[PDB]
Amino acid sequence: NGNNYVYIDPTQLPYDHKWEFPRNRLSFGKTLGAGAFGKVVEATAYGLIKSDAAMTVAVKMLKPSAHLTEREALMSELKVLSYLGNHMNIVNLLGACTIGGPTLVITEYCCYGDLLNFLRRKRDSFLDLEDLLSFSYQVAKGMAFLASKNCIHRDLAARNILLTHGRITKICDFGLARHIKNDSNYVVKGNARLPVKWMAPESIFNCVYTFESDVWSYGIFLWELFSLGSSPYPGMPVDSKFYKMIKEGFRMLSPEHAPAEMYDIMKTCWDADPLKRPTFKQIVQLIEKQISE
Amino acid sequence: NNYVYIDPTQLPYDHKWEFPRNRLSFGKTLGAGAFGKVVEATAYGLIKSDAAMTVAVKMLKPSAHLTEREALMSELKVLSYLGNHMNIVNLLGACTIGGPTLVITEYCCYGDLLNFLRRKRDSFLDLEDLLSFSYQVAKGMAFLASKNCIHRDLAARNILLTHGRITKICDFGLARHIKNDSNYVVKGNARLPVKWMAPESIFNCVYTFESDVWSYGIFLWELFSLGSSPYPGMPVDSKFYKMIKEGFRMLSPEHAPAEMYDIMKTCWDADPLKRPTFKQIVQLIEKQISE
Amino acid sequence: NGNNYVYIDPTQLPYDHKWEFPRNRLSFGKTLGAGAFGKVVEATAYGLIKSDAAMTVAVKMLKPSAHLTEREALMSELKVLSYLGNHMNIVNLLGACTIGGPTLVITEYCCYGDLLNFLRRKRDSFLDLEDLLSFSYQVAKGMAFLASKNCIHRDLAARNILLTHGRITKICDFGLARHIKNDSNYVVKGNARLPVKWMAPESIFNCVYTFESDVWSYGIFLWELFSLGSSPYPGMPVDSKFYKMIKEGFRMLSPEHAPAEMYDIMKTCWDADPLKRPTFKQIVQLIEKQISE
Amino acid sequence: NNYVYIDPTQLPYDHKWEFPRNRLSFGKTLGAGAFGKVVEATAYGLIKSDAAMTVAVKMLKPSAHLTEREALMSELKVLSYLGNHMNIVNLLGACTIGGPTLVITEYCCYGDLLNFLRRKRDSFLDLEDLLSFSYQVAKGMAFLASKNCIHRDLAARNILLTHGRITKICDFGLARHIKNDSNYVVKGNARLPVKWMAPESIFNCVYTFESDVWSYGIFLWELFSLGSSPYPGMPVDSKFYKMIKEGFRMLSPEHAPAEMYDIMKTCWDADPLKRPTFKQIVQLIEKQISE
């Protein structure tokens, strides 16, 4: 009754059927990633674009291990993706299958896989510095787009950036298609397993996920990136001591390969006051103005 | 679920809005409900540091529960999220530290539009002004829609009038009592404005963007009626609901141009996806303008 | 050769034919305004919008008194109008007739005529203050639109604002359809007859027409408006003394009916430094923030 | 004619761009023409007040006429009008008072793209990078088009390379001599880059938005050729022009993916209105990306 202005979230809202696509026009292939309850699969879609009779795509789907909770999560993801719109630097929705079977969410296939692996298998023969400047600019633009659509990414990290042609990087939601009890980057806090080393303190202590929370993670991502795929706070486990250190204001030092301008952005992203952190729009404009330096 | 849309009521309070409450004076109550009220006030140095202006302040009565404190704070965070527009009542500032929460918004000197239409029903202000009211309220809703917001009580009684012939959509939440207003009627758990609500909202309790358009149609009807009451004479009971489901509708207001009536009708399509969107309603009007 | 970045003006560019409309579907009626070389005519257009079989429109056309120079001016106007786009607060292009006869430019008809006349025939029974606030806001929005499309109006003045339904005002180009040797508001300077009392000094002395030049005229328009249709610098002829006065920095005083906020805008519009003048976007935002005062 | 579009070269010089020339040092010449040059330079306190950066400064030689002073000042006012974008060389500041006009823009450390392609023609940098170059240059042109600007000399030789794998469209006006470059050839009054010009530009001297797209096609051809010369072997004479009118075209570069070739072909449509716009070319590529 009170407060007549109610924000409507695209999750709670009709599924637009312009996305629906015949499940008899998909051929599933090798799995690309799986969690306990879901998986992303490589596939061929026939007649998805009138120019490409057969294009490789990725399909997100649940495993028969999955309950009602998961089935709704996948539909929410589909709905969310359906409202975002397209941008070069995210993985885009191509279509879905809801009628006549389990829900299938069809998105872009990114042939070069994810950025962390790429960075690590390349740590030796060091792809060079300019590619790394390019990736951080592109990820910034992609976060700026998500933020202009009022959207937050609650797991920004090199392991969720994918690589495709034209040297393009794309931000990705891996939800459900990743097993986190097996990954030490995810650690128990409260009920959940979270990526706390990528998380802003206000997110860890006060459970607040703002737009500036993402900017912190972007900072950890830059460190991740210029370290060529190393872990954040390398060697140190997440525990009482860590939380205390983050709270007191201790920060990581510059990676050996970060130019001075980037570490500079890193540091401001990690300001304890969220309000002193740059926005993604500012990061993008900063990288563009300083590109010749 | 990595991707998540931010809810405005979850964001932290932005201190850019903070305003010293020793710069406020209170005057007469504009509206009161069970748990809160809206008071006329003076704020010094609010826009210009030189100057003083009249504003409206919304606040809780001493008998407010945590649910009402949350409602008032949510009202504030939504307003802050929306930003400014000429056709809503805007947030001007808040007092949060040093006492009860105060939400400062625009004062609208001419009062609400329903009362204005009734007191003007005698002389007939002309049809050109009712056109402007239509256009402005649609512009205001198109704007709320664009920020992904819905209004739960769009009705001439929640539309305010200010200078420059400007009309503003307003959230009267918490500052109206309804237990004695025939327009609000018990259904299920709550008291609701049923004559203004779309059928799918009454039944399945679906509040969406197309629900508002329905209410816009009922508004257009109030408007070109000069503030007569909707579905006049009919009480709300089983008879009423059953009839609305079976396609029952109001006929054209005596003073509506046929086109505006056609928009009303399209607003009342039983099928939510056949109703116009506000953006479309704006664009219609912006051509029904030269003809 | 030098300078490879060349701005292309919509005047010099192909006429898009999506505007072309059959001249056998127009019936000309009474003239609304004429110059020596052209005129605007009231007309009926059959089948212009599928909803209105017969709507009144305005048609701009040359008189047989007109030379090649004028014929090109009218086509330039048509081209300009064709690129602007629509906005509620200007008079919009509806179509043209180029093939099989003289050029005809079809625009919106505004039933209540122009604002200056309206203001003057209403000076006695004083339509009230709130309508005047509304007109200045609407004209500001219309200038803001023109400026966002990089367009300037070189004759902004109450005599070029038209009135239509819904209490809507619309900015208008009267070019060619007005005789200026008969109107004392237009006065000789150099070769041309110009509206110098509406013109910014940098426009008068240095022949520079910027976006802030328009803002000056907007200021004179507000004065014109809150004086209920009086002439600017009433009684004083344009001559050496006037130019000197404008140059030294003398300004008009507030009209008897201008609220303090408006005269305030007036004054800043008339700053001798163009750079200290508000932009139309700022004027609009100022009027909106202060609307409750 | 009351409505008039502002030409950027007519606007007054904006002093927000002014920069003290005692904060500049000059180094080596990057490029020189008959009447002017572009020099490598250091500017202190240009972006950060703390710091120094390398920039490029464009200026007139002592033998420049009023037409060249105007060209240089027009270059400056156009750049100021366009504003920033990642894919053009941007204006950083100007020195106008206290001596000759100096136009400060971005230094691009890797030099021009034509030379880069040739020196890389040996090893084969891969096809993924040529895709990025295509996309970036189209993004840059789409941007110039959106500000209603045309480029009179779009060619790999006027595309510069900087950090982050970024390519930037550049105006080399005044800082190249052409009297000895076979790529510029006398036609009528001027020396022109004819192999890059659309047919309607050579004849009726029509320079429009669709003329640029033609040149973009020739660029795509240079690009996937690794900087071979266009219409290789053929000199420009009556033979040449007559053939271009009668539909003569280049065939696919040995290393072009078929789709990119299809865009080249559509860029070379004799009918200006059949050619894609840059906005369309961007959007194509942004899907030819996952396949």
Is beta strand B167-169 parallel, antiparallel or unpaired with respect to B159-161?
Answer: antiparallel
Measured in whole angstroms, the distance separating CA B2 from the mean position of its chain's CA atoms is: 34
Is beta strand C104-108 parallel, antiparallel or unpaired with respect to B159-161?
Answer: unpaired
- Cα separation, C53 vs C25, in Å, equals 11
D112 lies within 8 A of chain C by CB: no
Experimental method: X-ray
D83 lies within 8 A of chain A by CB: no
CATH number of C110-287: 1.10.510.10
CA atoms within 13 A on the CB side of B35: 15
The secondary element (H helix, E strand) that includes residue C70 is helix C68-84
Which of D11, D149, D208 is opposite residue C13, by nearest beta carbon? D208
CB C56 within 8 A of CB C94: no
Three-state SS for C106? Answer: strand
- Cα separation, D198 vs D214, in Å, equals 5
- Cα separation, D276 vs D282, in Å, equals 10
Which of C52, C86, C291 is opposite residue B163, by nearest beta carbon? C291
- Tell me how far CA of residue A56 lies from CA of A43, A95, A283, in angstroms: 6, 13, 33
Is beta strand A151-153 parallel, antiparallel or unpaired with respect to B3-5?
Answer: antiparallel
Token pair for C200: 């910014």
Burial of B270 (0-12, 13-18, 19+ CB in 10 A): middle
Residue C114 has what DSSP assignment? Answer: B
In 3D, which of A292, A293, A278, A272 has the Cα closest to residue A140? A278
Between the two ends of chain C, the Cα-to-Cα distance in Å is: 56
Burial of B180 (0-12, 13-18, 19+ CB in 10 A): exposed
Helices C129-148/C211-226 angle, 10° precision: 170
Q: Which residues of C are annotated as a binding site?
A: 5, 33-40, 60, 108-114, 159-160, 173
Interchain contact, D3 vs C77, CB within 8 Å: yes
The total of other beta-carbon atoms located within 10 Å of residue C86's CB is 12
CB A151 within 8 A of CB A81: no
Scored b (16 or more CB within 10 A) or e, A106-129 reads: bbbbbeeebbbebbeeeeeeeeee
Interchain contact, C3 vs D78, CB within 8 Å: yes
Token pair for C193: 């007859």
B205 lies within 8 A of chain A by CB: no
CATH number of D108-285: 1.10.510.10
Per-residue H/E/C for chain B: CCEEECCCCCCCCCHHHECCHHHEEEEEEEEECCCEEEEEEEEECCCCCCCEEEEEEEEECCCCCHHHHHHHHHHHHHHHHHCCCCCECCEEEEECCCCCCEEEEECCCCEEHHHHHHHCCCCCCCHHHHHHHHHHHHHHHHHHHHCCEEECCCCHHHEEECHHHCEEECCCCCCCCCCCCCCCEEECCEEECHHHCCHHHHCCCCCCHHHHHHHHHHHHHHHHCCCCCCCCCCCCCHHHHHHHHCCCCCCCCCCCCHHHHHHHHHHCCCCCCCCCCHHHHHHHHCCCCCC
> Nearest residue of A to residue B147 by CA position?
A7
Token pair for D61: 């030689």
Which of B11, B71, B191 is opposite residue A3, by nearest beta carbon? B71
CATH topology agreement for domains D12-107 and D108-285: no
Three-state SS for C290? Answer: coil
The total of other beta-carbon atoms located within 10 Å of residue A28's CB is 12
Cβ contacts of residue D65 below 8 Å, gap of 6+? D35
CB C163 within 8 A of CB C169: yes
- Cα separation, B232 vs B222, in Å, equals 11
Per-residue H/E/C for chain A: CCCCEEECCCCCCCCCHHHECCHHHEEEEEEEEECCCEEEEEEEEEEEECCEEEEEEEEEEECCCCCHHHHHHHHHHHHHHHHHCCCCCECCEEEEECCCCCCEEEEECCCCCEHHHHHHHCCCCCCCHHHHHHHHHHHHHHHHHHHHCCEEECCCCHHHEEECHHHCEEECCCCCCCCCCCCCCCEEECCEEECHHHCCHHHHHCCCCCHHHHHHHHHHHHHHHHCCCCCCCCCCCCCHHHHHHHHHCCCCCCCCCCCHHHHHHHHHHCCCCHHHCCCHHHHHHHHHHCCCC
Provide long-range contacts, Cβ within 8 A and 24+ apart, for C251-257. C252/C223, C254/C226, C255/C223, C255/C226, C255/C227, C255/C228, C255/C230, C256/C226, C256/C227, C257/C129, C257/C132, C257/C226, C257/C227, C257/C228
- Cα separation, A167 vs A123, in Å, equals 18
- Tokens 């709130």 locate to C130
Which chain A residues touch B194 with a CB distance below 8 Å?
Answer: none
Interchain contact, D75 vs C3, CB within 8 Å: yes
**φ, ψ at A198 (rounded to 5°):** -95, 5
CB A30 within 8 A of CB A67: no
In 3D, which of C132, C194, C180, C124 has the Cα closest to residue C158? C132
Interchain contact, C166 vs B109, CB within 8 Å: no
Residue-range domain boundaries for chain B: 12-107, 108-285
Interchain contact, B5 vs A151, CB within 8 Å: yes
CA distance to partner chain A, nearest, from residue D212 (Å):
23
Which of B55, B84, B108 is opposite residue C288, by nearest beta carbon? B84
Q: For residue B273, which amino acid is it?
A: L
- Tokens 């300009």 locate to C80
- Tell me how far CA of residue C78 lies from CA of C12, C98, C104, in angstroms: 12, 10, 9
B3 lies within 8 A of chain A by CB: yes
Per-residue H/E/C for D143-187: HHHHCCEEECCCCHHHEEECHHHCEEECCCCCCCCCCCCCCCEEE
Asked if C touches D (at least 3 Cβ pairs < 8 angstroms), the answer reads: yes
A146 lies within 8 A of chain B by CB: yes
D126 lies within 8 A of chain A by CB: no
Q: List the resolution, Å.
A: 2.6
Largest CA distance in chain C: 63
Interchain contact, C165 vs B107, CB within 8 Å: no
B158 lies within 8 A of chain A by CB: yes
Interchain contact, A133 vs D108, CB within 8 Å: no
B71 lies within 8 A of chain A by CB: yes
- Cα separation, A279 vs D151, in Å, equals 34
According to CATH, the superfamily of the domain at A14-109 is Phosphorylase Kinase; domain 1 (3.30.200.20)
Neighbours of A (≥3 Cβ pairs closer than 8 A)? B, D
Per DSSP, which regions of C37-186 are E strands?
38-49, 52-62, 93-97, 104-108, 151-153, 161-163, 169-171
Residue C14 has what DSSP assignment? Answer: P
Please state which of the four CATH numbers 3.40.50.970, 3.40.47.10, 3.30.200.20, 3.40.50.2300 is assigned to the domain occupying D12-107.
3.30.200.20
- Tokens 């006006």 locate to D173
The residues of C that are catalytic are 155
Question: Of A52, A124, A128, A155, which is the active-site residue?
Answer: A155
- Tokens 């002829």 locate to C237
CB C83 within 8 A of CB C10: yes
D129 lies within 8 A of chain A by CB: yes
Which chain A residues touch B173 with a CB distance below 8 Å?
Answer: 1-5
- Cα separation, D13 vs A132, in Å, equals 38
Residue C198 has what DSSP assignment? Answer: G
- Judge whether A109 is annotated as a binding position: yes
Which of B84, B107, B131 is opposite residue C166, by nearest beta carbon? B131
> Nearest residue of D to residue C151 by CA position?
D5
Interchain contact, D290 vs A165, CB within 8 Å: yes
A155 catalytic residue (yes or no) = yes
Token pair for A137: 């600019």
Question: Of B50, B153, B237, B271, which is the active-site residue?
Answer: B153
